[PDB]
From Swiss-Prot, chain A:
GO cellular component: mitochondrial inner membrane; mitochondrial small ribosomal subunit; mitochondrion
Main location: mitochondrion
Subcellular location: Mitochondrion
Keyword GTP-binding in record: no
Family listed: Belongs to the bacterial ribosomal protein bS21 family.
Residue ranges of coiled coil: none
GO BP, sorted A to Z: mitochondrial translation; translation
Protein name, entry field: Small ribosomal subunit protein bS21m
Organism: Homo sapiens
From Swiss-Prot, chain B:
Top-level taxon: Eukaryota
Subcellular location per the Swiss-Prot or TrEMBL entry: Mitochondrion
Protein family per UniProt: Belongs to the universal ribosomal protein uS9 family.
Protein name (record): Small ribosomal subunit protein uS9m
Annotated S-S bridges: none
Subunit architecture: Component of the mitochondrial small ribosomal subunit (mt-SSU). Mature mammalian 55S mitochondrial ribosomes consist of a small (28S) and a large (39S) subunit. The 28S small subunit contains a 12S ribosomal RNA (12S mt-rRNA) and 30 different proteins. The 39S large subunit contains a 16S rRNA (16S mt-rRNA), a copy of mitochondrial valine transfer RNA (mt-tRNA(Val)), which plays an integral structural role, and 52 different proteins.
Residue numbers of the full-length protein present here: 199 to 264 of 396
Length: 85, 66
């Protein structure tokens, strides 16, 4: 019922179809459409869906905290200033 | 550079491979700088001499017949 060639459309630049498809796939991935399709192939029962969502939220929390710690400590990867002591 | 066994013989103390690595790294860092005569003598205390045997083939003497 909507207009066509507006949603999920990426224009190809100078026949660079590879990059256009990469951009389209990146858009779908960032918006979460690809994972949604993959999960909608077979029905996910509500208990399984809740378990998956809880696991993914805990994973997101842990990954974000670990990334924050890594970025915080990365400055300390520099050379040893007190070598030999 | 002297091997770990030579360093242990010099120091009369048991050592570890990582301790030897730290010591050798410190000595190399000492060499890299604008070291003076005493700083070079200290390094030469630990430096050992290696006999570079030439792979050049020995040439037979030219003999003469009757």
């Amino acid at each position: 019922k909507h207009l066509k060639f507006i949603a999920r459309t990426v224009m190809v630049q100078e026949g660079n179809v590879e990059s256009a498809y990469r951009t389209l796939n990146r858009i779908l991935t960032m918006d979460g459409l690809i994972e949604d399709i993959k999960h909608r192939r077979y029905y996910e029962k509500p208990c399984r869906r809740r378990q998956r969502e809880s696991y993914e939220r805990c994973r997101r929390i842990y990954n974000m905290e670990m990334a924050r710690k890594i970025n915080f400590l990365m400055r300390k990867n520099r050379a040893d200033p007190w070598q030999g002591c | 550079w002297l091997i770990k066994e030579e360093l242990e013989e010099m120091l009369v103390e048991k050592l570890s491979d990582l301790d030897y690595m730290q010591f050798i790294r410190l000595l190399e860092k000492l060499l890299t700088s604008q070291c003076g005569a005493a700083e070079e003598e200290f390094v030469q205390r630990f430096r050992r001499s290696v006999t570079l045997e030439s792979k050049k083939q020995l040439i037979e003497p030219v003999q003469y017949d009757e």
